[PDB]
Design an enzyme around this catalytic site. Structure first.
Site, PDB file in Angstrom:
ATOM      1  CD  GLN A  60      -5.378  -3.742 -11.907  1.00  0.00           C
ATOM      2  OE1 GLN A  60      -4.549  -2.926 -11.458  1.00  0.00           O
ATOM      3  NE2 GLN A  60      -6.719  -3.844 -11.142  1.00  0.00           N
ATOM      4  CE1 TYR A 120     -10.562  -7.114  -9.670  1.00  0.00           C
ATOM      5  CE2 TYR A 120      -8.999  -6.754  -7.866  1.00  0.00           C
ATOM      6  CZ  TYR A 120      -9.493  -6.351  -9.179  1.00  0.00           C
ATOM      7  OH  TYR A 120      -8.871  -5.433  -9.696  1.00  0.00           O
ATOM      8  CG  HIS A 205     -11.735  -5.378  -3.132  1.00  0.00           C
ATOM      9  ND1 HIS A 205     -12.031  -4.123  -2.915  1.00  0.00           N
ATOM     10  CD2 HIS A 205     -10.908  -5.387  -4.288  1.00  0.00           C
ATOM     11  CE1 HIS A 205     -11.639  -3.175  -3.894  1.00  0.00           C
ATOM     12  NE2 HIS A 205     -10.898  -4.073  -4.711  1.00  0.00           N
ATOM     13  NE  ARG A 208     -12.722   1.413  -0.882  1.00  0.00           N
ATOM     14  CZ  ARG A 208     -12.336   0.653  -1.912  1.00  0.00           C
ATOM     15  NH1 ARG A 208     -12.798   0.399  -3.068  1.00  0.00           N
ATOM     16  NH2 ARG A 208     -10.881   0.283  -1.693  1.00  0.00           N
ATOM     17  CD  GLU A 234      -4.902   2.078  -3.649  1.00  0.00           C
ATOM     18  OE1 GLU A 234      -5.894   1.284  -3.704  1.00  0.00           O
ATOM     19  OE2 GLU A 234      -4.197   2.323  -4.571  1.00  0.00           O
ATOM     20  CG  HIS A 268      -2.730   0.378  -1.382  1.00  0.00           C
ATOM     21  ND1 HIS A 268      -1.565   0.146  -2.402  1.00  0.00           N
ATOM     22  CD2 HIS A 268      -3.733  -0.201  -2.089  1.00  0.00           C
ATOM     23  CE1 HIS A 268      -2.275  -0.405  -3.427  1.00  0.00           C
ATOM     24  NE2 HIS A 268      -3.256  -0.627  -3.296  1.00  0.00           N
ATOM     25  CG  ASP A 319      -1.655  -2.405  -6.867  1.00  0.00           C
ATOM     26  OD1 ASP A 319      -2.703  -3.267  -7.279  1.00  0.00           O
ATOM     27  OD2 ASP A 319      -2.095  -1.214  -6.329  1.00  0.00           O
TER      28      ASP A 319
HETATM   29  N1  LIG Z   1      -5.283   0.335  -6.874  1.00  0.00           N
HETATM   30  C1  LIG Z   1      -6.466  -0.055  -6.492  1.00  0.00           C
HETATM   31  N2  LIG Z   1      -6.987  -1.012  -7.298  1.00  0.00           N
HETATM   32  C2  LIG Z   1      -8.333  -1.455  -6.648  1.00  0.00           C
HETATM   33  C3  LIG Z   1      -9.312  -0.726  -6.714  1.00  0.00           C
HETATM   34  C4  LIG Z   1     -10.394  -0.703  -5.549  1.00  0.00           C
HETATM   35  O1  LIG Z   1      -9.732  -0.873  -4.339  1.00  0.00           O
HETATM   36  O2  LIG Z   1     -11.586  -0.752  -5.573  1.00  0.00           O
HETATM   37  C5  LIG Z   1      -8.477  -2.993  -7.338  1.00  0.00           C
HETATM   38  O3  LIG Z   1      -7.995  -3.392  -8.281  1.00  0.00           O
HETATM   39  O4  LIG Z   1      -9.702  -3.513  -6.998  1.00  0.00           O
HETATM   40 ZN   LIG Z   2      -4.355  -4.016  -5.224  1.00  0.00          ZN
END
Ligand SMILES: N=CN[C@@H](CC(=O)O)C(=O)O
Ligand SMILES: [Zn+2]
Ligand SMILES: N=CN[C@@H](CC(=O)O)C(=O)O
Ligand SMILES: [Zn+2]
Lengths: 450, 451
Positions: A60, A120, A205, A208, A234, A268, A319
């Protein structure tokens, strides 16, 4: 070898003329305050334990700042995620490694000495596994080795698009494993990570992305000594969706259904009601706070004052890596509480009125706990991870003890971090990392490719 | 003299291979896009107009970060203020100048090329005037000149401890002037300020510190060309007290009793209700937003999106100087809006989706207006005030145009500012100011004296 600090923050507090002996394996072997330098390397400023970074998605960093373009009157976390998906769809194994190496170098320069990589991105561009399914995990470990940063790798179980085991979306195809494939990945990783001196953790993760039965499977698989990380609460939408699925809030559901304890890092945990805050603090789990990303994504403000008052444990993570700054995360942790309450001096302890020291003490302990590594304090038997502040800086030179932490965290910045040591090895000297030029050259090429 | 930038942010937008001609007096004389670099200094990265800093109290930098100690269960703005009063009681003219010079050097390194000094420390320790009433103002002007930063000096009228002309407290004695003394101070300052190339503005500390009649006196005194600054609506307590005094809120009161216009800079203006936001925007006054200090003091979050959407003008100031960073102010200006709304991408224009560019454009314009100086854009006839970002930085080198502003402001930091020019003179080169070593030595000694 031996190093000598005129000032150092030891577990019992600030000390003078501290001579440290460090063994060949990078472990603090002897710590003597009020000593002579006697041959030892005389350090250039105040010495602190290095700060653990308890939450990272390395790739990221490549898009950091690029998502600041209004495409909707109500842009949000969710429109951002769509953009993050499109970018992750394009990343080759080689690009991922280059980005990670560059990022870890920048982390080191900021005073982060160890990182928990919440990893991931597993599979090829069309969602098929690589010949070695651990391909990208191995590249993350090699990148950390190249930068020289401590590493807890958290391979991530990701299976679903939403609560109730919704089918994964196309955008998520590179992330997806079933439980068996996931457990096999953990097994494949033991040997190479052990050789590297790197650590491993269990990771879901989010609620969800995995089912309750999958959580049970992974938790029963015998890795009872490992950290367990999860994104949770979050975004308000996650809260609403959880309620519609279970009749419970996310943190509420987790505590009702899983034996959450000190092993756990709840990343978070932003939307935590008073009962959820209480349950967290009681459990000894670590809240993984990523202040700059939470602000960037419009997540909201964590109830840190309530959590801290009840003995809650926390640490910081960069993050999405829009910011790589220990100073910025701790400063705006405090500032966010101030903006909410419309009052000053929010995060302190009954026994510690100094804000900077409260923040630093907290994040060190929570970070060490979350990474599952022997770090976060300068004591015999802990790893020699530390940073050296600027002794020639007029603000720091004129300050003593906790006043110096305040000058740094509240009036100063990243540039005041001059030297950084990880496992007894100097990886940053006078603001410079030996691998920076080569990494920047490879990195700029990758940016051009994207 | 002539400089050449491969990329520069001009008033029409981003341009390439821009050759700038700079006059002997530091004014931009010619700006030619798509030119060549013959006989001109090749610049090392992206060029931007320098950022005006529209609100500063220089001496406060000496205490920055030291007031971060819990003294009560719920520490207040007013307990901090008494702490600030304690240091001001010790400051000598020499210490004042040394602190200001050091501060202005740091400001330049961050990309601030001009500063509005909201200056209310006037008198000797016992509250009597110095032999030269302008002593401390002159110290500020001399420090700005030593650093080489642009300066609008704002001597502050400060007369009272509270609404209704409450008698000033002992702790405020060094600040106190009546209207006539203040107006004479202004007249005394004109010649030395213009001799140094510095500007002047009118300034009331706040509605707590002056009376309505004093405001009328000063505004009628014939200085119709000068900026007018005032602290307003920073804390809920000021709102409550104003209401108890007048039956009006502070901004509401000001707009009902005073002809507020484009000359005005309303500093903080944090507690602005909807009608007050609309009146501010319609008036063309500049909101002086000091984000790091406002967060540090727990003031609250300004309704920047509502204000901007109605045509409001704004700029940024470092105020108490806990932060000296163009990046941090603009970044957390946006982020404060994100935290409040729980949404992203808040401060944009109908004709400009780029957040970084929206923020930079706005703060440049508002800053320049509030200072009353010909700055804030690289156009012929404006002063050659600019910064050069790091062209070797991989994030910036790989970006073009407004994306570059996003990388700097949202993913980068102060260290990406490499070179800084004010009035046609290099004052920072490769992150270094020529006077930094001398300044730091004097400064660390002053810190020892004060603490
Ligand atoms: N700041 C959050 N990022 C998460 C998004 C998520 O939870 O789907 C992520 O990089 O997977
Ligand atoms: Zn994250
Ligand atoms: N941020 C507030 N500072 C103000 C305090 C006040 O308005 O009395 C000042 O320095 O004068
Ligand atoms: Zn102020």
């Amino acid at each position: 070898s031996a190093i000598f600090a005129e000032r150092a923050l030891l577990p019992e507090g600030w000390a003078r003329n501290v001579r440290f002996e460090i063994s060949a394996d990078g472990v603090l072997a002897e710590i003597r305050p009020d000593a002579n330098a006697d041959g030892a390397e005389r350090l250039g400023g105040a010495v602190l334990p290095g700060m653990p970074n308890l939450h990272s998605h390395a790739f990221q960093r490549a898009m950091a700042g690029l998502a600041e373009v209004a495409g909707n009157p109500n842009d949000s976390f969710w429109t951002w995620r769509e953009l993050m998906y499109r970018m992750v769809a394009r990343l080759s194994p080689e690009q991922i490694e280059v980005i990670a190496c560059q990022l870890y170098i920048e982390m080191l320069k900021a005073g982060y000495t160890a990182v928990a990589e919440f990893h991931y991105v597993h599979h090829d561009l069309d969602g098929r596994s690589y010949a070695d399914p651990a391909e990208l995990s191995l590249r993350i470990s090699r990148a950390a080795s190249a930068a020289g940063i401590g590493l807890t790798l958290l391979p991530v179980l990701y299976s679903h698009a939403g609560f109730g085991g919704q089918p994964a979306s196309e955008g998520q195809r590179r992330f997806i494993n079933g439980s068996e494939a996931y457990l096999e990945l953990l097994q494949r990783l033991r040997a190479p990570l052990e050789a590297a001196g790197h650590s491993l953790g269990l990771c879901f993760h989010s609620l969800r992305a995995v089912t309750p039965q999958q959580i049970a499977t992974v938790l029963a698989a015998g890795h009872d000594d490992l950290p367990v990380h999860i994104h949770i609460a979050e975004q308000q939408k996650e809260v609403d969706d959880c309620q519609a699925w279970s009749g419970r809030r996310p943190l509420q559901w987790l505590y009702e259904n899983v034996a959450v304890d000190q092993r756990w890092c709840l990343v978070h945990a932003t939307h935590a009601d008073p009962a959820e805050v209480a349950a967290m603090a009681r459990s000894g789990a670590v809240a993984g706070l990523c202040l700059s990303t939470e602000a960037n994504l419009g997540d909201g403000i964590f109830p840190a004052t309530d959590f801290l008052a009840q003995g809650g444990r926390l640490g910081i993570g960069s993050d999405s890596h829009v910011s790589l700054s220990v100073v910025e995360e701790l400063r705006w942790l405090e500032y966010g509480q101030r903006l909410r309450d419309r009052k000053r001096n929010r995060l302190y302890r009954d026994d510690q009125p100094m804000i900077g020291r409260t923040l630093y003490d907290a994040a060190l302990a929570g970070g060490a706990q979350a990474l599952g590594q022997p770090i976060g304090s300068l004591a015999v038997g802990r790893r020699a991870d530390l940073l050296v502040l600027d002794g020639n800086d007029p603000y720091l030179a004129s300050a003593e003890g906790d006043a110096l932490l305040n000058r740094w965290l509240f009036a100063g910045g990243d540039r005041q971090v001059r030297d950084v040591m990880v496992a007894g090895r100097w990886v940053v000297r006078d603001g410079r990392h030996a691998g920076e030029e080569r990494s920047a050259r490879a990195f700029v090429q990758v940016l051009g490719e994207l």
